[PDB]
DNA sequence: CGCTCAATTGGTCGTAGACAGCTCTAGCACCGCTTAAACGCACGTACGCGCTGTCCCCCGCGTTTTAACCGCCAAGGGGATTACTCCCTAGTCTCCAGGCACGTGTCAGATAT
DNA sequence: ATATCTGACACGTGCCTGGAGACTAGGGAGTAATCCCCTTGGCGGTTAAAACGCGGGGGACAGCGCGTACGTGCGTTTAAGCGGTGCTAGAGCTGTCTACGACCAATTGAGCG
C-alpha cells in the first residue's frame, strides 16, 4: 500500500520560480510537512467558522475568512487574490 | 508629605474584581480603531466592555511578571526595555 | 462521456483540488462541502508554498549551493518576519538557527 | 483618541498587578502596546461579524477572537 | 556501566549554550539544565506513550512523538504528522 | 584572551547538526521509559526526532537566557538567570 | 599600535551517495453521468438595544520639593577558559537471536450442501 | 448419503526487530595558571510621589429605528454512487554532481615596543 504525500506538487511549484534548483529528501520532507500544516490550520478554521454559525457546509466565504485570519499582513489579501482567481475561473 | 510604606493600593485593587477604565472614552476608542477596517458598524455595549475586561486582565498580564523581569535585572523600577524583554520571550512582538 | 481533466485545469491552478476535496471528506470536517472551498484552498497551498520556496532559492544561491537543504528554508524564514509570525511555533529539522551575535557581546 | 487611557488607569492596573516603582517614560510607549493589543483583538472579532453579514459587532465574535489566543470566558453566549 | 544522566555531557551542554548564543558558563548550570530537559521529555514521552497505547502497540513510532509534540504546541516538521 | 568562545558561537551557528551523542541520548530516553510503562521499544528516527525537538527547546532556552543575562548587565550565565524562563513563558 | 608570527580560511584532487528520471507498471482514486434530500438563500415581518441629547459631580491633570534609586566609578578575588595534561567509553561493525505473515502443510469433519 | 471443505494439530525461512560483544581512537576528562568578570558599595546625579486645588468629560436621566431577530417556500447545492480512465509510487540503477573532505598558501589575531 502507498505512502501518500505532496512531493511532486511541491517539486512542480519549485519550477514556478527556480528550475535551476535541486532538492534533498530532507527538505522535501520539510515541504511535505508545511503543506499539510497549512491544510490542518485552514480546514479546522473553516469548519469552526461554519460551526460558529451552525452550518452544514464549509464554504468559499468560510475559507476566505479563515485565510483572512491565517496571516497578520499583506500575504492574507495576496492569498485571497489567488483564491478568488481560482474560484472565479473554475465557476465561469 | 513624602509618602512612606506605599502598600495602600496593593491592599485594595487585588481584594475585588472592580473595573478600572471609564466606559465612554474606551467606547469611542475601540470604535474609532475598528472603522479603519470597516465603517458603518454597530457595536454591542456588552461586546466592547467585555474587551475592556480582557484588556484590563491582559494589562495585569503586562505587569504581573514584567516587574519580576526588572527584579531579575536588579531594578525595582520598571523601564520600557523590560517590556522589550518579557514580551519578546512571550513572542508577541517578533 | 469523454476523456477526463482535473478541476484545477479549469480553475487556472496547478495544485490538485480533487485530493483536497478527499482530504476534507476523509477529514470529516462537515456534513457537506462547498465546491468553492477546496478550489480556493489549492491556491492557498500554491501561494504560501511558492513565496517561501523563492526565499529558499535566495538562501541557497547566496550560500553558493545548488541543492536545497533544511538550512536554506530555515534562513529563508528568519529573513522574513511575515513568515516568522507563522512558523515561530515550528522547528525546521536540521536547519539549525539564524547565525546571530548580539552587539553587547563583541570585542571592543 | 488613544489618550483616553489615562495615567491613573495604568497606575490602578499595575497596582492590581502588585507593582512598585516606574520611570515616567514607561506610560506613553505602554499606551502604544495596549493600542496594538486592542487593535488586534478588535479586527479579529469584527471580521466574524461582518463575514456573518451582521453589521453589529457581536459579543460571540469577541469570545471567538479571544479564543484564538486561548483566553476563553463565559456569560457572553459560550 | 553508568545510568546517572551524565550522558548529557559537559561538552554537549557547552555546545548547546554556544548555539543558543551565550558566552561564559559557570559550573552551577549543568545539573539544572539536565532537570529542565528531563521535565520536557516527561511532558512529550507521556503523550507519545498515549499514542502508542491507543493503538495497543509495543514500539514507539515517529508519529507517536510527532503528534505528542503537536498537541503540546511545540510543533515539528520533517517526519510527517 | 579568555574569549575566543565568541568565535565558537559563530562556528556552532555555521554548524546545524545535533550536539548530543546518540547512544547517550538513547540511554537517557530508555531510562525515562522503562519505569513509566513496560518495555517501550523505539524506532531510531523517533528517538532522533525527540533529540532534535529537545535540543531545539534547549537552544531556545539559551537564546532567552542570553537576553536574561544581557538585560541583567552580564555576559555570563547563572542558574537564577535561566529560572526566569519557566515562570515567564508558561510552564 | 606596527610589525612577527601563529591561528582559520579558500582552491584543487578525487572520490562516492542520494538524488532525479525513470519505467512502465499499474492500482486505483478523480471525474461524469446519473441518482438524489435538505439547508440556506432569498425574504417577508416582527420590532429592541442599537444610536442620539440635558443637569451634575466626579476623574485627571498641573503644581508644591524631593530620594528612592539607577547608573557612576570607586572598591573588591574566583573560577572559566584556555591550554596541555591522560584515561576512557561512542561509535563502529559483525554476528547473535527471535517475531511476523506467509503457503502449503497434514488429515480429516463440526456443520450441513 | 453425499461431496467437500475446513481447525488442531502444526518444524519449514525471508523479511523485520533489537542485543551484546571487543577494538579503535575521538574525545571526554583532570588539572592548573591566571585574567578578566562578576563584581560590592554609596552618594551623588538625576528624577515619581499624593496631593490641593483644580480643569476636562463621564454619567443618570430621556427618546427614535432599521437594524437584529424568526421561520416558510423552495431550488440550488452537495451527497452519494459506479464505471472509466488519467493519475501517482515502486523500485529498480543508473548517471551522476554535488557535496564531501585532505592537502596546501591566503587572511585574522596576541604581544609591546
Q: What is the CATH number for E62? A: 1.10.20.10
Sorted by sequence, the CB contacts under 8 Å of residue C67 that are 6+ apart come out as A21, A22, A23, A24, C60
Q: Where are the beta strands (DSSP E) in F1-91?
A: 41-42, 76-77
What is the phi-psi region of residue E76: left when phi exceeds 0, alpha when psi lies from -120 to 50, beta otherwise? Answer: beta
Report yes or no: B52 and D41 within 8 Å, Cβ to Cβ. Answer: no
Return the number of other C-beta atoms located less than 10 Å from residue E71's C-beta: 13
* CATH class of the domain defined by A7-91: mainly alpha
Angle separating helix axes F44-71 and B81-89, nearest 10 degrees: 170
Strand pairing report for D21-22 and F41-42: unpaired
Cell numbers representing residue B14 in the block: 487585588
Q: Is F81 close to B65, i.e. CB distance below 8 A?
A: no
- Phi first, then psi: give them for residue C35, nearest 5 degrees: -60, -25
What's the per-residue H, E or C state across chain B?
CCCCCCCCCHHHHCCCCCCCCCHHHHHHHHHHHHCCCCCCCEECHHHHHHHHHHHHHHHHCCCCCHHHHHHHCCCCEECCHHHHHHHHHCCCCC
Q: Report resolution (Å) to 1 decimal.
A: 4.9
Q: What is the DSSP letter of C90?
A: E
Rg (CA), chain A: 16
CA–CA separation, C71 vs C77, rounded Å?
Answer: 10
- Phi first, then psi: give them for residue A47, nearest 5 degrees: -60, -40
Report yes or no: C15 and C42 within 8 Å, Cβ to Cβ. Answer: yes
CA–CA separation, A12 vs A35, rounded Å?
Answer: 13
Report yes or no: C36 and A58 within 8 Å, Cβ to Cβ. Answer: no
Return the number of other C-beta atoms located less than 10 Å from residue F90's C-beta: 8
Sign of CA dihedral B33, B36, B39, B41: negative
Cell numbers representing residue C36 in the block: 468553492
Q: Which fold has domain C4-108?
A: Histone, subunit A (1.10.20)
- Which among F13, F30, F81, F20 has a CA at the least distance from the CA of E10? F20
CA–CA separation, A67 vs A44, rounded Å?
Answer: 11
Cα atoms in the 13 Å half-sphere on the side-chain side of F47: 19
- CA C8 distance to own-chain centroid: 19
E24 has a chain C CB within 8 A of its CB: no
Report yes or no: C68 and A21 within 8 Å, Cβ to Cβ. Answer: yes
Containing structural domain, residue E36: 1-79
- Phi first, then psi: give them for residue B43, nearest 5 degrees: -130, 120
- Phi first, then psi: give them for residue C92, nearest 5 degrees: -80, 105
- Phi first, then psi: give them for residue E55, nearest 5 degrees: -80, -5
Return the number of other C-beta atoms located less than 10 Å from residue E15's C-beta: 19
Sketch out chain B's domains with CATH numbers: 10-93 (1.10.20.10)
Experimental technique used?
Answer: cryo-EM
Report yes or no: F85 and F61 within 8 Å, Cβ to Cβ. Answer: yes
Report yes or no: A59 and C35 within 8 Å, Cβ to Cβ. Answer: no
- Return the exposure string of C40-65: e unless at least 16 CB atoms fall within 10 Å of the residue's CB, then b: bbbbbbbbbbbbbbebbbebbeeeee
Give, as ranges, the nucleotides of chain H with any atom within 7 Å of a protein CB.
17-19, 27-29, 35-39, 47-50, 52, 57-59, 67-69, 77-79, 84-90, 97-99, 109-111
CA–CA separation, C16 vs C7, rounded Å?
Answer: 8
- Which among B31, A63, B70, D49 has a CA at the least distance from the CA of C41? A63
Q: Is F63 close to C97, i.e. CB distance below 8 A?
A: yes
Report yes or no: A80 and A67 within 8 Å, Cβ to Cβ. Answer: yes
Q: Which residues of chain E neighbour A30 with C-beta distances below 8 Å?
A: 77-78
H/E segment holding residue E79: none
Q: How far apart, in Å, are the Cα atoms of D61 and each of A53, D39, D49?
A: 11, 14, 6
Q: Which residues pair with A23 in a beta bridge?
A: C68
Amino acid at each position: 500500500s502507498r505512502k501518500e504525500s505532496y512531493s511532486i506538487y511541491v517539486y512542480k511549484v519549485l519550477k514556478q520560480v527556480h528550475p535551476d534548483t535541486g532538492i534533498s529528501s530532507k527538505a522535501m520532507g520539510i515541504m511535505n510537512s508545511f503543506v499539510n500544516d497549512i491544510f490542518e490550520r485552514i480546514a479546522g478554521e473553516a469548519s469552526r467558522l461554519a460551526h460558529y454559525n451552525k452550518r452544514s457546509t464549509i464554504t468559499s466565504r468560510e475559507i476566505q475568512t479563515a485565510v483572512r485570519l491565517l496571516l497578520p499582513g499583506e500575504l492574507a489579501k495576496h492569498a485571497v487574490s489567488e483564491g478568488t482567481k481560482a474560484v472565479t475561473k473554475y465557476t465561469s | 508629605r513624602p509618602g512612606t510604606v506605599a502598600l495602600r493600593e496593593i491592599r485594595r485593587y487585588q481584594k475585588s474584581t472592580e473595573l478600572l477604565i471609564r466606559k465612554l472614552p474606551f467606547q469611542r476608542l475601540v470604535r474609532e480603531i475598528a472603522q479603519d477596517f470597516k465603517t458603518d458598524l454597530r457595536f454591542q455595549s456588552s461586546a466592547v466592555m467585555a474587551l475592556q475586561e480582557a484588556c484590563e486582565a491582559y494589562l495585569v498580564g503586562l505587569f504581573e511578571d514584567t516587574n519580576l523581569c526588572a527584579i531579575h535585572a536588579k531594578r525595582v523600577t520598571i523601564m520600557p526595555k523590560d517590556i522589550q524583554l518579557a514580551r519578546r520571550i512571550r513572542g508577541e512582538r517578533a | 462521456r469523454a476523456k477526463a481533466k482535473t478541476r484545477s485545469s479549469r480553475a487556472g491552478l496547478q495544485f490538485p483540488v480533487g485530493r483536497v476535496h478527499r482530504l476534507l471528506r476523509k477529514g470529516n470536517y462537515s456534513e457537506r462541502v462547498g465546491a468553492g472551498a477546496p478550489v480556493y484552498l489549492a491556491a492557498v497551498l500554491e501561494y504560501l508554498t511558492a513565496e517561501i520556496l523563492e526565499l529558499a532559492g535566495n538562501a541557497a544561491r547566496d550560500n553558493k549551493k545548488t541543492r536545497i537543504i533544511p538550512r536554506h528554508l530555515q534562513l529563508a524564514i528568519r529573513n522574513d518576519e511575515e513568515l516568522n509570525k507563522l512558523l515561530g511555533r515550528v522547528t525546521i529539522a536540521q536547519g539549525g538557527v539564524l547565525p546571530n551575535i548580539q552587539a553587547v557581546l563583541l570585542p571592543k | 483618541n488613544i489618550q483616553g487611557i489615562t495615567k491613573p488607569a495604568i497606575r490602578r492596573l499595575a497596582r492590581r498587578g502588585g507593582v512598585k516603582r516606574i520611570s515616567g517614560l514607561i506610560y506613553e510607549e505602554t499606551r502604544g502596546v495596549l493600542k496594538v493589543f486592542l487593535e488586534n483583538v478588535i479586527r479579529d472579532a469584527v471580521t466574524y461579524t461582518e463575514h456573518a453579514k451582521r453589521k453589529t459587532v457581536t459579543a460571540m465574535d469577541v469570545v471567538y477572537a479571544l479564543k484564538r489566543q486561548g483566553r476563553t470566558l463565559y456569560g457572553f453566549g459560550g
